PDB file of all heavy atoms in Angstrom:
ATOM      1  N   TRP A   1       0.735  -1.227   0.000  1.00 54.22           N
ATOM      2  CA  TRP A   1       0.000   0.000   0.000  1.00 54.22           C
ATOM      3  C   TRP A   1       0.772   1.289   0.000  1.00 54.22           C
ATOM      4  O   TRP A   1       0.369   2.201  -0.637  1.00 54.22           O
ATOM      5  CB  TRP A   1      -1.032  -0.049   1.115  1.00 54.22           C
ATOM      6  CG  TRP A   1      -0.434   0.100   2.507  1.00 54.22           C
ATOM      7  CD1 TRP A   1       0.052  -0.918   3.332  1.00 54.22           C
ATOM      8  CD2 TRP A   1      -0.325   1.316   3.241  1.00 54.22           C
ATOM      9  NE1 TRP A   1       0.446  -0.371   4.548  1.00 54.22           N
ATOM     10  CE2 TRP A   1       0.216   0.991   4.516  1.00 54.22           C
ATOM     11  CE3 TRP A   1      -0.629   2.678   2.952  1.00 54.22           C
ATOM     12  CZ2 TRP A   1       0.445   1.969   5.475  1.00 54.22           C
ATOM     13  CZ3 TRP A   1      -0.408   3.646   3.911  1.00 54.22           C
ATOM     14  CH2 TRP A   1       0.129   3.280   5.165  1.00 54.22           C
ATOM     15  N   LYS A   2       1.844   1.395   0.772  1.00 51.61           N
ATOM     16  CA  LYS A   2       2.675   2.614   0.806  1.00 51.61           C
ATOM     17  C   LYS A   2       3.334   2.906  -0.531  1.00 51.61           C
ATOM     18  O   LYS A   2       3.369   4.042  -0.963  1.00 51.61           O
ATOM     19  CB  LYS A   2       3.736   2.475   1.874  1.00 51.61           C
ATOM     20  CG  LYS A   2       3.233   2.723   3.269  1.00 51.61           C
ATOM     21  CD  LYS A   2       4.437   3.122   4.170  1.00 51.61           C
ATOM     22  CE  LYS A   2       4.119   3.076   5.642  1.00 51.61           C
ATOM     23  NZ  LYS A   2       5.352   3.130   6.455  1.00 51.61           N
ATOM     24  N   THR A   3       3.994   1.900  -1.122  1.00 50.09           N
ATOM     25  CA  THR A   3       4.611   1.997  -2.447  1.00 50.09           C
ATOM     26  C   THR A   3       3.559   2.428  -3.500  1.00 50.09           C
ATOM     27  O   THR A   3       3.848   3.267  -4.340  1.00 50.09           O
ATOM     28  CB  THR A   3       5.102   0.645  -2.854  1.00 50.09           C
ATOM     29  OG1 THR A   3       6.027   0.262  -1.838  1.00 50.09           O
ATOM     30  CG2 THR A   3       5.779   0.675  -4.221  1.00 50.09           C
ATOM     31  N   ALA A   4       2.342   1.920  -3.385  1.00 47.86           N
ATOM     32  CA  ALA A   4       1.281   2.321  -4.349  1.00 47.86           C
ATOM     33  C   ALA A   4       0.973   3.799  -4.253  1.00 47.86           C
ATOM     34  O   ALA A   4       0.795   4.461  -5.315  1.00 47.86           O
ATOM     35  CB  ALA A   4       0.015   1.491  -4.085  1.00 47.86           C
ATOM     36  N   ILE A   5       0.839   4.321  -3.002  1.00 45.96           N
ATOM     37  CA  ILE A   5       0.620   5.748  -2.821  1.00 45.96           C
ATOM     38  C   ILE A   5       1.808   6.574  -3.255  1.00 45.96           C
ATOM     39  O   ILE A   5       1.633   7.633  -3.874  1.00 45.96           O
ATOM     40  CB  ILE A   5       0.174   6.077  -1.415  1.00 45.96           C
ATOM     41  CG1 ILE A   5      -1.116   5.319  -1.194  1.00 45.96           C
ATOM     42  CG2 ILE A   5       0.020   7.578  -1.192  1.00 45.96           C
ATOM     43  CD1 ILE A   5      -1.658   5.436   0.274  1.00 45.96           C
ATOM     44  N   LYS A   6       3.026   6.093  -2.993  1.00 46.29           N
ATOM     45  CA  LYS A   6       4.198   6.854  -3.490  1.00 46.29           C
ATOM     46  C   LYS A   6       4.231   7.027  -5.004  1.00 46.29           C
ATOM     47  O   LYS A   6       4.531   8.170  -5.487  1.00 46.29           O
ATOM     48  CB  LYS A   6       5.540   6.300  -2.956  1.00 46.29           C
ATOM     49  CG  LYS A   6       5.751   6.551  -1.467  1.00 46.29           C
ATOM     50  CD  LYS A   6       6.913   5.688  -0.997  1.00 46.29           C
ATOM     51  CE  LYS A   6       7.253   5.983   0.447  1.00 46.29           C
ATOM     52  NZ  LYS A   6       8.295   5.038   0.930  1.00 46.29           N
ATOM     53  N   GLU A   7       4.000   5.912  -5.741  1.00 48.83           N
ATOM     54  CA  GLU A   7       3.993   5.938  -7.214  1.00 48.83           C
ATOM     55  C   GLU A   7       2.836   6.805  -7.661  1.00 48.83           C
ATOM     56  O   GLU A   7       3.001   7.602  -8.565  1.00 48.83           O
ATOM     57  CB  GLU A   7       3.812   4.538  -7.765  1.00 48.83           C
ATOM     58  CG  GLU A   7       3.850   4.460  -9.239  1.00 48.83           C
ATOM     59  CD  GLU A   7       3.464   3.068  -9.661  1.00 48.83           C
ATOM     60  OE1 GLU A   7       4.322   2.177  -9.525  1.00 48.83           O
ATOM     61  OE2 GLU A   7       2.274   2.833  -9.894  1.00 48.83           O
ATOM     62  N   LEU A   8       1.685   6.699  -7.003  1.00 47.42           N
ATOM     63  CA  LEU A   8       0.555   7.615  -7.375  1.00 47.42           C
ATOM     64  C   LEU A   8       0.964   9.088  -7.277  1.00 47.42           C
ATOM     65  O   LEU A   8       0.733   9.865  -8.190  1.00 47.42           O
ATOM     66  CB  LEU A   8      -0.645   7.334  -6.471  1.00 47.42           C
ATOM     67  CG  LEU A   8      -1.899   8.149  -6.864  1.00 47.42           C
ATOM     68  CD1 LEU A   8      -2.540   7.539  -8.130  1.00 47.42           C
ATOM     69  CD2 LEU A   8      -2.850   8.169  -5.687  1.00 47.42           C
ATOM     70  N   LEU A   9       1.635   9.498  -6.181  1.00 47.71           N
ATOM     71  CA  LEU A   9       2.024  10.919  -6.023  1.00 47.71           C
ATOM     72  C   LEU A   9       3.055  11.382  -7.057  1.00 47.71           C
ATOM     73  O   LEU A   9       2.978  12.486  -7.574  1.00 47.71           O
ATOM     74  CB  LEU A   9       2.573  11.177  -4.608  1.00 47.71           C
ATOM     75  CG  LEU A   9       1.550  10.884  -3.480  1.00 47.71           C
ATOM     76  CD1 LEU A   9       2.281  10.906  -2.041  1.00 47.71           C
ATOM     77  CD2 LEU A   9       0.468  11.994  -3.555  1.00 47.71           C
ATOM     78  N   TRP A  10       3.969  10.490  -7.406  1.00 45.07           N
ATOM     79  CA  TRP A  10       5.029  10.771  -8.363  1.00 45.07           C
ATOM     80  C   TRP A  10       4.314  11.069  -9.725  1.00 45.07           C
ATOM     81  O   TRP A  10       4.709  11.968 -10.475  1.00 45.07           O
ATOM     82  CB  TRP A  10       5.890   9.492  -8.517  1.00 45.07           C
ATOM     83  CG  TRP A  10       6.953   9.540  -9.553  1.00 45.07           C
ATOM     84  CD1 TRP A  10       7.924  10.476  -9.682  1.00 45.07           C
ATOM     85  CD2 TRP A  10       7.174   8.591 -10.615  1.00 45.07           C
ATOM     86  NE1 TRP A  10       8.749  10.184 -10.760  1.00 45.07           N
ATOM     87  CE2 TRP A  10       8.320   9.015 -11.327  1.00 45.07           C
ATOM     88  CE3 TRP A  10       6.533   7.427 -11.016  1.00 45.07           C
ATOM     89  CZ2 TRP A  10       8.821   8.312 -12.409  1.00 45.07           C
ATOM     90  CZ3 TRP A  10       7.045   6.711 -12.121  1.00 45.07           C
ATOM     91  CH2 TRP A  10       8.150   7.144 -12.782  1.00 45.07           C
ATOM     92  N   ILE A  11       3.403  10.185 -10.143  1.00 44.90           N
ATOM     93  CA  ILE A  11       2.696  10.403 -11.411  1.00 44.90           C
ATOM     94  C   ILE A  11       1.684  11.608 -11.423  1.00 44.90           C
ATOM     95  O   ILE A  11       1.728  12.502 -12.350  1.00 44.90           O
ATOM     96  CB  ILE A  11       1.893   9.119 -11.799  1.00 44.90           C
ATOM     97  CG1 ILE A  11       2.862   7.879 -11.982  1.00 44.90           C
ATOM     98  CG2 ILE A  11       1.114   9.315 -13.172  1.00 44.90           C
ATOM     99  CD1 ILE A  11       1.972   6.504 -11.870  1.00 44.90           C
ATOM    100  N   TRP A  12       0.793  11.634 -10.444  1.00 44.18           N
ATOM    101  CA  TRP A  12      -0.307  12.610 -10.423  1.00 44.18           C
ATOM    102  C   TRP A  12      -0.071  13.940  -9.708  1.00 44.18           C
ATOM    103  O   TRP A  12      -0.625  14.943 -10.142  1.00 44.18           O
ATOM    104  CB  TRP A  12      -1.539  11.984  -9.762  1.00 44.18           C
ATOM    105  CG  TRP A  12      -2.280  11.008 -10.699  1.00 44.18           C
ATOM    106  CD1 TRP A  12      -1.929   9.704 -11.059  1.00 44.18           C
ATOM    107  CD2 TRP A  12      -3.444  11.347 -11.460  1.00 44.18           C
ATOM    108  NE1 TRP A  12      -2.831   9.236 -12.006  1.00 44.18           N
ATOM    109  CE2 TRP A  12      -3.774  10.210 -12.263  1.00 44.18           C
ATOM    110  CE3 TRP A  12      -4.250  12.494 -11.525  1.00 44.18           C
ATOM    111  CZ2 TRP A  12      -4.885  10.198 -13.120  1.00 44.18           C
ATOM    112  CZ3 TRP A  12      -5.384  12.476 -12.396  1.00 44.18           C
ATOM    113  CH2 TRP A  12      -5.679  11.341 -13.167  1.00 44.18           C
ATOM    114  N   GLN A  13       0.800  13.958  -8.702  1.00 43.15           N
ATOM    115  CA  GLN A  13       1.045  15.159  -7.917  1.00 43.15           C
ATOM    116  C   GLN A  13       2.323  15.843  -8.358  1.00 43.15           C
ATOM    117  O   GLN A  13       2.285  17.010  -8.755  1.00 43.15           O
ATOM    118  CB  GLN A  13       1.124  14.839  -6.418  1.00 43.15           C
ATOM    119  CG  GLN A  13       1.069  16.096  -5.603  1.00 43.15           C
ATOM    120  CD  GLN A  13       1.470  15.800  -4.195  1.00 43.15           C
ATOM    121  OE1 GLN A  13       2.568  15.357  -3.979  1.00 43.15           O
ATOM    122  NE2 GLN A  13       0.530  15.934  -3.231  1.00 43.15           N
ATOM    123  N   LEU A  14       3.454  15.121  -8.387  1.00 43.34           N
ATOM    124  CA  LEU A  14       4.693  15.737  -8.846  1.00 43.34           C
ATOM    125  C   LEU A  14       4.643  15.782 -10.373  1.00 43.34           C
ATOM    126  O   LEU A  14       5.368  16.578 -11.025  1.00 43.34           O
ATOM    127  CB  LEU A  14       5.913  14.887  -8.407  1.00 43.34           C
ATOM    128  CG  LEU A  14       5.978  14.448  -6.908  1.00 43.34           C
ATOM    129  CD1 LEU A  14       7.419  13.841  -6.591  1.00 43.34           C
ATOM    130  CD2 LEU A  14       5.634  15.487  -5.986  1.00 43.34           C
ATOM    131  N   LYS A  15       3.892  14.877 -10.996  1.00 43.54           N
ATOM    132  CA  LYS A  15       3.806  14.828 -12.474  1.00 43.54           C
ATOM    133  C   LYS A  15       5.189  14.740 -13.022  1.00 43.54           C
ATOM    134  O   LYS A  15       5.580  15.480 -13.966  1.00 43.54           O
ATOM    135  CB  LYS A  15       3.075  16.082 -13.019  1.00 43.54           C
ATOM    136  CG  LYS A  15       1.609  16.048 -12.673  1.00 43.54           C
ATOM    137  CD  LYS A  15       0.764  17.371 -12.932  1.00 43.54           C
ATOM    138  CE  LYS A  15       1.009  18.454 -11.942  1.00 43.54           C
ATOM    139  NZ  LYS A  15      -0.007  19.607 -11.971  1.00 43.54           N
ATOM    140  N   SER A  16       5.946  13.764 -12.548  1.00 45.86           N
ATOM    141  CA  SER A  16       7.353  13.722 -12.953  1.00 45.86           C
ATOM    142  C   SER A  16       7.675  12.478 -13.750  1.00 45.86           C
ATOM    143  O   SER A  16       7.074  11.447 -13.484  1.00 45.86           O
ATOM    144  CB  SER A  16       8.239  13.714 -11.655  1.00 45.86           C
ATOM    145  OG  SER A  16       9.465  12.989 -11.831  1.00 45.86           O
ATOM    146  N   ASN A  17       8.618  12.547 -14.687  1.00 46.67           N
ATOM    147  CA  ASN A  17       8.968  11.352 -15.411  1.00 46.67           C
ATOM    148  C   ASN A  17      10.405  10.976 -14.973  1.00 46.67           C
ATOM    149  O   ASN A  17      11.034  10.185 -15.612  1.00 46.67           O
ATOM    150  CB  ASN A  17       8.953  11.599 -16.938  1.00 46.67           C
ATOM    151  CG  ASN A  17       9.946  12.612 -17.374  1.00 46.67           C
ATOM    152  OD1 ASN A  17      10.482  13.360 -16.578  1.00 46.67           O
ATOM    153  ND2 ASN A  17      10.104  12.725 -18.635  1.00 46.67           N
ATOM    154  N   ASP A  18      10.877  11.540 -13.857  1.00 44.84           N
ATOM    155  CA  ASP A  18      12.270  11.295 -13.423  1.00 44.84           C
ATOM    156  C   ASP A  18      12.321  10.216 -12.368  1.00 44.84           C
ATOM    157  O   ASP A  18      11.870  10.419 -11.264  1.00 44.84           O
ATOM    158  CB  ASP A  18      12.875  12.574 -12.881  1.00 44.84           C
ATOM    159  CG  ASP A  18      14.298  12.394 -12.324  1.00 44.84           C
ATOM    160  OD1 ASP A  18      14.942  11.377 -12.518  1.00 44.84           O
ATOM    161  OD2 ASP A  18      14.770  13.302 -11.651  1.00 44.84           O
ATOM    162  N   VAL A  19      12.988   9.121 -12.698  1.00 44.35           N
ATOM    163  CA  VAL A  19      13.056   8.005 -11.774  1.00 44.35           C
ATOM    164  C   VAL A  19      13.818   8.387 -10.472  1.00 44.35           C
ATOM    165  O   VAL A  19      13.473   7.924  -9.371  1.00 44.35           O
ATOM    166  CB  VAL A  19      13.538   6.750 -12.464  1.00 44.35           C
ATOM    167  CG1 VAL A  19      13.631   5.602 -11.430  1.00 44.35           C
ATOM    168  CG2 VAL A  19      12.509   6.319 -13.560  1.00 44.35           C
ATOM    169  N   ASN A  20      14.702   9.375 -10.592  1.00 45.62           N
ATOM    170  CA  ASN A  20      15.436   9.853  -9.409  1.00 45.62           C
ATOM    171  C   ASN A  20      14.481  10.417  -8.406  1.00 45.62           C
ATOM    172  O   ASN A  20      14.651  10.178  -7.229  1.00 45.62           O
ATOM    173  CB  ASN A  20      16.525  10.859  -9.802  1.00 45.62           C
ATOM    174  CG  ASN A  20      17.503  10.266 -10.819  1.00 45.62           C
ATOM    175  OD1 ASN A  20      18.254   9.332 -10.514  1.00 45.62           O
ATOM    176  ND2 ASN A  20      17.460  10.774 -12.047  1.00 45.62           N
ATOM    177  N   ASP A  21      13.390  11.049  -8.834  1.00 49.51           N
ATOM    178  CA  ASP A  21      12.434  11.562  -7.873  1.00 49.51           C
ATOM    179  C   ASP A  21      11.804  10.397  -7.130  1.00 49.51           C
ATOM    180  O   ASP A  21      11.458  10.495  -5.983  1.00 49.51           O
ATOM    181  CB  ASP A  21      11.269  12.320  -8.540  1.00 49.51           C
ATOM    182  CG  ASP A  21      11.647  13.632  -9.065  1.00 49.51           C
ATOM    183  OD1 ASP A  21      12.554  14.242  -8.473  1.00 49.51           O
ATOM    184  OD2 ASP A  21      11.028  14.062 -10.049  1.00 49.51           O
ATOM    185  N   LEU A  22      11.576   9.310  -7.819  1.00 47.60           N
ATOM    186  CA  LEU A  22      10.953   8.177  -7.168  1.00 47.60           C
ATOM    187  C   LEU A  22      11.969   7.496  -6.235  1.00 47.60           C
ATOM    188  O   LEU A  22      11.618   7.046  -5.112  1.00 47.60           O
ATOM    189  CB  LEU A  22      10.436   7.245  -8.281  1.00 47.60           C
ATOM    190  CG  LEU A  22       9.413   6.171  -7.935  1.00 47.60           C
ATOM    191  CD1 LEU A  22       8.153   6.682  -7.205  1.00 47.60           C
ATOM    192  CD2 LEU A  22       9.074   5.533  -9.259  1.00 47.60           C
ATOM    193  N   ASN A  23      13.247   7.513  -6.610  1.00 45.91           N
ATOM    194  CA  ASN A  23      14.254   6.892  -5.744  1.00 45.91           C
ATOM    195  C   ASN A  23      14.356   7.608  -4.416  1.00 45.91           C
ATOM    196  O   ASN A  23      14.549   6.932  -3.384  1.00 45.91           O
ATOM    197  CB  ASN A  23      15.636   6.842  -6.412  1.00 45.91           C
ATOM    198  CG  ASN A  23      15.729   5.849  -7.535  1.00 45.91           C
ATOM    199  OD1 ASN A  23      16.544   6.029  -8.427  1.00 45.91           O
ATOM    200  ND2 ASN A  23      14.865   4.828  -7.544  1.00 45.91           N
ATOM    201  N   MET A  24      14.171   8.939  -4.417  1.00 49.16           N
ATOM    202  CA  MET A  24      14.181   9.758  -3.196  1.00 49.16           C
ATOM    203  C   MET A  24      13.059   9.390  -2.221  1.00 49.16           C
ATOM    204  O   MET A  24      13.161   9.692  -1.047  1.00 49.16           O
ATOM    205  CB  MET A  24      14.057  11.255  -3.510  1.00 49.16           C
ATOM    206  CG  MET A  24      15.390  12.038  -3.566  1.00 49.16           C
ATOM    207  SD  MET A  24      15.300  13.649  -4.515  1.00 49.16           S
ATOM    208  CE  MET A  24      13.864  14.505  -3.720  1.00 49.16           C
ATOM    209  N   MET A  25      11.983   8.759  -2.696  1.00 48.54           N
ATOM    210  CA  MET A  25      10.905   8.371  -1.823  1.00 48.54           C
ATOM    211  C   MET A  25      11.138   6.966  -1.461  1.00 48.54           C
ATOM    212  O   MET A  25      10.224   6.288  -0.922  1.00 48.54           O
ATOM    213  CB  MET A  25       9.581   8.496  -2.536  1.00 48.54           C
ATOM    214  CG  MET A  25       9.312   9.854  -3.142  1.00 48.54           C
ATOM    215  SD  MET A  25       7.808   9.814  -4.179  1.00 48.54           S
ATOM    216  CE  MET A  25       6.669   9.609  -2.890  1.00 48.54           C
ATOM    217  N   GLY A  26      12.357   6.506  -1.777  1.00 46.60           N
ATOM    218  CA  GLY A  26      12.806   5.169  -1.524  1.00 46.60           C
ATOM    219  C   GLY A  26      12.189   4.076  -2.396  1.00 46.60           C
ATOM    220  O   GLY A  26      12.048   2.951  -1.953  1.00 46.60           O
ATOM    221  N   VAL A  27      11.806   4.361  -3.633  1.00 45.91           N
ATOM    222  CA  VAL A  27      11.156   3.325  -4.477  1.00 45.91           C
ATOM    223  C   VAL A  27      12.052   3.048  -5.676  1.00 45.91           C
ATOM    224  O   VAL A  27      12.477   3.972  -6.351  1.00 45.91           O
ATOM    225  CB  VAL A  27       9.731   3.779  -4.950  1.00 45.91           C
ATOM    226  CG1 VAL A  27       9.158   2.879  -6.012  1.00 45.91           C
ATOM    227  CG2 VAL A  27       8.821   3.870  -3.795  1.00 45.91           C
ATOM    228  N   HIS A  28      12.278   1.752  -5.934  1.00 44.45           N
ATOM    229  CA  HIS A  28      13.125   1.286  -6.962  1.00 44.45           C
ATOM    230  C   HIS A  28      12.480   0.389  -7.972  1.00 44.45           C
ATOM    231  O   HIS A  28      13.169  -0.016  -8.900  1.00 44.45           O
ATOM    232  CB  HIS A  28      14.290   0.555  -6.353  1.00 44.45           C
ATOM    233  CG  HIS A  28      15.218   1.456  -5.649  1.00 44.45           C
ATOM    234  ND1 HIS A  28      16.170   2.200  -6.319  1.00 44.45           N
ATOM    235  CD2 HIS A  28      15.263   1.845  -4.348  1.00 44.45           C
ATOM    236  CE1 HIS A  28      16.738   3.037  -5.466  1.00 44.45           C
ATOM    237  NE2 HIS A  28      16.208   2.837  -4.261  1.00 44.45           N
ATOM    238  N   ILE A  29      11.157   0.166  -7.877  1.00 43.53           N
ATOM    239  CA  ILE A  29      10.506  -0.726  -8.839  1.00 43.53           C
ATOM    240  C   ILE A  29      10.503  -0.229 -10.252  1.00 43.53           C
ATOM    241  O   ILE A  29      10.050  -0.973 -11.120  1.00 43.53           O
ATOM    242  CB  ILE A  29       9.025  -1.060  -8.473  1.00 43.53           C
ATOM    243  CG1 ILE A  29       8.180   0.226  -8.550  1.00 43.53           C
ATOM    244  CG2 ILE A  29       8.950  -1.596  -7.067  1.00 43.53           C
ATOM    245  CD1 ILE A  29       6.701   0.013  -8.287  1.00 43.53           C
ATOM    246  N   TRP A  30      10.843   1.045 -10.498  1.00 47.20           N
ATOM    247  CA  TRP A  30      10.871   1.501 -11.897  1.00 47.20           C
ATOM    248  C   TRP A  30      12.287   1.599 -12.477  1.00 47.20           C
ATOM    249  O   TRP A  30      12.451   2.083 -13.605  1.00 47.20           O
ATOM    250  CB  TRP A  30      10.233   2.872 -12.023  1.00 47.20           C
ATOM    251  CG  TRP A  30       8.774   2.826 -11.791  1.00 47.20           C
ATOM    252  CD1 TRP A  30       8.118   2.595 -10.592  1.00 47.20           C
ATOM    253  CD2 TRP A  30       7.757   3.139 -12.751  1.00 47.20           C
ATOM    254  NE1 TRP A  30       6.757   2.802 -10.756  1.00 47.20           N
ATOM    255  CE2 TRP A  30       6.511   3.138 -12.066  1.00 47.20           C
ATOM    256  CE3 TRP A  30       7.772   3.421 -14.108  1.00 47.20           C
ATOM    257  CZ2 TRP A  30       5.300   3.426 -12.704  1.00 47.20           C
ATOM    258  CZ3 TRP A  30       6.561   3.695 -14.752  1.00 47.20           C
ATOM    259  CH2 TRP A  30       5.335   3.697 -14.038  1.00 47.20           C
ATOM    260  N   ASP A  31      13.310   1.267 -11.668  1.00 50.38           N
ATOM    261  CA  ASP A  31      14.720   1.467 -12.121  1.00 50.38           C
ATOM    262  C   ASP A  31      15.111   0.813 -13.443  1.00 50.38           C
ATOM    263  O   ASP A  31      15.827   1.419 -14.222  1.00 50.38           O
ATOM    264  CB  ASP A  31      15.698   0.994 -11.077  1.00 50.38           C
ATOM    265  CG  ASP A  31      15.592   1.740  -9.754  1.00 50.38           C
ATOM    266  OD1 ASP A  31      15.028   2.850  -9.679  1.00 50.38           O
ATOM    267  OD2 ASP A  31      16.156   1.217  -8.780  1.00 50.38           O
ATOM    268  N   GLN A  32      14.565  -0.366 -13.721  1.00 49.06           N
ATOM    269  CA  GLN A  32      14.860  -1.104 -14.939  1.00 49.06           C
ATOM    270  C   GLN A  32      14.491  -0.322 -16.181  1.00 49.06           C
ATOM    271  O   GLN A  32      15.036  -0.565 -17.230  1.00 49.06           O
ATOM    272  CB  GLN A  32      14.072  -2.412 -15.000  1.00 49.06           C
ATOM    273  CG  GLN A  32      13.542  -2.919 -13.661  1.00 49.06           C
ATOM    274  CD  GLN A  32      12.797  -4.247 -13.776  1.00 49.06           C
ATOM    275  OE1 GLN A  32      12.936  -5.129 -12.914  1.00 49.06           O
ATOM    276  NE2 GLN A  32      12.006  -4.398 -14.842  1.00 49.06           N
ATOM    277  N   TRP A  33      13.501   0.561 -16.061  1.00 47.46           N
ATOM    278  CA  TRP A  33      13.016   1.336 -17.201  1.00 47.46           C
ATOM    279  C   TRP A  33      13.656   2.668 -17.382  1.00 47.46           C
ATOM    280  O   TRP A  33      13.301   3.412 -18.300  1.00 47.46           O
ATOM    281  CB  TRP A  33      11.517   1.487 -17.114  1.00 47.46           C
ATOM    282  CG  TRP A  33      10.900   0.214 -17.454  1.00 47.46           C
ATOM    283  CD1 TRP A  33      10.890  -0.387 -18.688  1.00 47.46           C
ATOM    284  CD2 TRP A  33      10.153  -0.630 -16.591  1.00 47.46           C
ATOM    285  NE1 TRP A  33      10.164  -1.564 -18.635  1.00 47.46           N
ATOM    286  CE2 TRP A  33       9.694  -1.723 -17.361  1.00 47.46           C
ATOM    287  CE3 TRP A  33       9.812  -0.557 -15.247  1.00 47.46           C
ATOM    288  CZ2 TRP A  33       8.904  -2.722 -16.833  1.00 47.46           C
ATOM    289  CZ3 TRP A  33       9.020  -1.554 -14.703  1.00 47.46           C
ATOM    290  CH2 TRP A  33       8.569  -2.626 -15.497  1.00 47.46           C
TER     291      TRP A  33
END
């Protein structure tokens, strides 16, 4: 659940396409891409 909310905020709130922003929230599930 936490990871789901983090990815939601990255896409809809920060509106960012930068994986580094997601890494700062401690999420790495998108690193391969």
